[PDB]
Design a protein around this ligand. Sequence first.
Ligand SMILES: O=C1O[C@H](CO)[C@H](O)[C@H](O)[C@H]1O
Ligand SMILES: [Mg+2]
Ligand SMILES: [Mg+2]
Ligand SMILES: [Mg+2]
Ligand code: NA
Ligand code: NA
Ligand code: NA
Ligand code: NA
Ligand code: NA
Lengths: 204, 1011
Amino acid sequence: AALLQCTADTLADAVLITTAHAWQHQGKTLFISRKTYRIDGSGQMAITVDVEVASDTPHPARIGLNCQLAQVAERVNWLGLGPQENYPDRLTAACFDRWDLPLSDMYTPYVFPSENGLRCGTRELNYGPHQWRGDFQFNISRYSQQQLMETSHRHLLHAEEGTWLNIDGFHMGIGGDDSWSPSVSAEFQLSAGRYHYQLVWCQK
Amino acid sequence: RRDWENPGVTQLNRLAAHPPFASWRNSEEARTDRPSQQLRSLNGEWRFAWFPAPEAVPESWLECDLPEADTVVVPSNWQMHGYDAPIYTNVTYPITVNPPFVPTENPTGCYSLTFNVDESWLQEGQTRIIFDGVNSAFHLWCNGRWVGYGQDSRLPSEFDLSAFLRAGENRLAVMVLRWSDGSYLEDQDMWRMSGIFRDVSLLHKPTTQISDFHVATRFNDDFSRAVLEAEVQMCGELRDYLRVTVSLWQGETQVASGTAPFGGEIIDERGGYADRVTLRLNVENPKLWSAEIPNLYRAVVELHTADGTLIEAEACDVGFREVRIENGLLLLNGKPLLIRGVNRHEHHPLHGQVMDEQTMVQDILLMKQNNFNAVRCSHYPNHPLWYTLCDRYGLYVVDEANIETHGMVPMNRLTDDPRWLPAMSERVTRMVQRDRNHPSVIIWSLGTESGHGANHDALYRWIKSVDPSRPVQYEGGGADTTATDIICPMYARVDEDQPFPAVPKWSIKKWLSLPGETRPLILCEYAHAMGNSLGGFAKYWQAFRQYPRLQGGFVWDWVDQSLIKYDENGNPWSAYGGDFGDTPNDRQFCMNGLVFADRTPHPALTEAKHQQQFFQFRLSGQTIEVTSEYLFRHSDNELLHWMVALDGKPLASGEVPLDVAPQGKQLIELPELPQPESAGQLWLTVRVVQPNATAWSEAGHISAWQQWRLAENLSVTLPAASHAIPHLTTSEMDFCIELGNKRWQFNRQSGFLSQMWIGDKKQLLTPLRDQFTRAPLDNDIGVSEATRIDPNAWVERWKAAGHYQAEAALLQCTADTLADAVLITTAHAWQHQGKTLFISRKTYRIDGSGQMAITVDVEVASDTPHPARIGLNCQLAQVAERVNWLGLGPQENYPDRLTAACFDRWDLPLSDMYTPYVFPSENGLRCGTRELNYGPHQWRGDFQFNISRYSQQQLMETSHRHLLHAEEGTWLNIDGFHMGIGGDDSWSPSVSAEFQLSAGRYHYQLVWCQK
Ligand SMILES: O=C1O[C@H](CO)[C@H](O)[C@H](O)[C@H]1O
Ligand SMILES: [Mg+2]
Ligand SMILES: [Mg+2]
Ligand SMILES: [Mg+2]
Ligand code: NA
Ligand code: NA
Ligand code: NA
Ligand code: NA
Ligand code: NA
């Protein structure tokens, strides 16, 4: 990530932070992320994200944000599709409702570790004192994406400090028509070029 | 005898049907198709008188010209001369349904002609009169004596006048009835007119004559050898010295010839036809006929004496081709066809249903120029010249019998009734007898919309028995009955089923594999082109190409059936149903064409041309793969032009000759491309150009094109921020932004940008507000009948939900000062009687560079019908001459109809950004636009837009385009999103799910600034 902009303005009843980053690889600008963070007097932080994706770079696996929370709570409560793991091209079975599960159930123990536990069509997520609102996809666990891709067997994974949260505005399909050739259908590939999503982070 | 109210009497004393005759008495004239002294035209000025009913016609008219009669031009429709009104009704019969009776008040057209006949014509031989088309029935008199009667408005009626004529002056008396029992079989969706609308002529034949002749061509497996079989029939006295010679010519070279006396082979216990003979000619390596290469030979049929004296000669153009269905595929010369067809009615805005060569040629040229290779004679046999033109220019033809009983209840009430079998059979058998020698005709049709009756099965078999060389199709009763060799549905969709009881319209892909089904499927009607339409056209062609047995279809239809009327100043305007006081009527439903009545193209025509292209392309790295969809010809008049441009700026281009065999592929390796400096998206555009002119196109004609996004370099270098800082002025009623001498005014009561100033000049006539509606397209209204409303139509759903009445409610309006700009935030709720339809949240950021960045996020209640659009609109004070934009164009294009449009820098006059659809509606949109320039304004982003002097309000309030008036300033509609236009049909919701704005939440951003 290469910082292009980072400003801060004081508004009538809030503080507005504006940023812009570009992800490059060997001189090639892969992505551009432009965000605004609006923190008002109610304590709510409204995050607006607009991403540009080079039309000639392979369509990205996801477009979101991530961070490792210091908090490690027993339960995860969300208003969205569930209760089980569901992805854009595999969510017909999931139902929209208020779900509450122990953190462990938010992780799918695939023998060969990979991205897992995602939940789509979520308007509200609650973890510890945190609450995220909007229209997003998310997965939450004690395992970072990095560890998952570097680990070959599930019994070799180790809970990291805190809880890793991945909040996606958009997420690519998982496919499966076969597992030895690209099988994600065009309609589930992130090829729009420009993406937008907004999230509100606050304490409950 | 009221013969016009008896389906049993379809004619009296009418001669047998037959192929086009000219009775040449010179073999050379026959070969070269020169005019014949024996075939005289009686077209020109005639005497005409209109009467309310046949009982009102004075008997003195049979022998003397009526002093009150007028002198009019024939052929013509008397409605076009104003004697009575033409009627436009779709399904409902124009007369009370009470077969076989018609109204006692039956408009009667009394035509009469005084002409000269030379004695030489009456001293020997036979003199017949030929009426190519009389609508709908008539009685004929000659010099006061009754000759005969005839029905079927679309086929010639011939009568022998040999014993009625006298040397010198003669007078014809023709009483044409507008309505007859024949009208029950002519319920086509078109203007209901009448009169002597096709040519009238006199033909002299020797007593001993050629009375009929059939030409057939069969081949071996590889078409390297053919046999031309010609059966010839004669009338008159048989003599042993009589002979028939059939010669086949290619240009001026005779390639084959055969001679023989009359006397066919033994056929049954009673012998054979002593008055017929069949000649068989062997042809090696014949040049084959196709729409691709319309090779034609000439066959001359000579009746003569053994010692060489010619009696008479007849002839026809011969196209060597085989049509057959094998293993579920329609094949022409052994190859599976892909029908790029269209339905075509014989219509002229001024002359009505009278056809002329110039209009016919114009249509064929436009059709071929727009990649059509086939036409359906919807829904009757056409003017005879039409087939001659199709044979020569090269178009596959579906010849259709003049039978449609759409208004009956049920639809097959007459066609299943043996009492109507005779009337129906003549409409079928006489068509075949007339056009069976035309190579362009490859399929026979039993008519249209008459349900499925036993009469159809009988006639289907009659054709199969009489002419095995052509498949027979018929859509009535479910499109796949036992009376059709081809599954020929009307408006069946690609993926979606329409399970109507009894006659469901299955997705065409699903239809092909229904248990036990094996026939090919070719839609006889699809992509209803009414008004702003043809949305989803590309979906049909992707399917046609992927599925072998989906062999195309015929678009409905070619030309708007609008008619010309004039205002008080003599200015002509396009009229439709009801504009002539005709009622009941189905208003604008008569206009469903790809081109306007004057043949000016509708935007949809370019979409058809592109999807029907004969060359397909694929790109891999720097290699272009060109695939030919031609079946017989090599690309010997094609060159590929390619060009790369960065945001409209030419970077590199070149040409490469195309040398692709039919169905073959050619790989073209593009040179090294100099990576551009500035950021932006590189676009590759290829076009196939025909360097040499053809019989149907001018040199340089573009027949195909395609575009691809190449490399893209995102702009990361932030622009040098200006030094100026916008200023915010706050009052109780407004938030005013000031930069230099520029001002932006936001009303605090309404929450909208109400005005903008460039010094002392105002920029808006109306505030900039959100818009979620569009003046309804014909597809939005969805009605095939003027009297039948519909709560399911998109327009009715939008109206009922209060979309057109939605009032904006300000929820918030704030202003904040930033380090280098002023930020305006607003939120509005659009509601209808307590129900919130949409919520719009916006932010306007004006910086020191004078740029106003507008961010718009909209919420759409899930339970409200999906909106027609999601954008903003305003009436600009300015009126500029040109419109310049970087986006899809140059022509009008919508989300489900923009594959033909190309991304580039376009620049047109304001007038061209408005499409003059006779029935006004939302129009002129251009999608995928990144920059728009008009006057001192420039909008940037990624939107769709239309700009004109007509507000959406006037458009939806006006029924005719000539009634539109330019408004002050210019109306601009900038949409972040716009709903598909649809068109699979225009009488039920047809916009596909993926083109409906159902996401619930939308986001789009625009930058407005001066230039
Ligand atoms: O099914 C049909 O649809 C068209 C609607 O314009 C027109 O009425 C055609 O003649 C008819 O065959
Ligand atoms: Mg009759
Ligand atoms: Mg009809
Ligand atoms: Mg001519
Ligand atoms: Na792994
Ligand atoms: Na096909
Ligand atoms: Na119509
Ligand atoms: Na060529
Ligand atoms: Na209108």
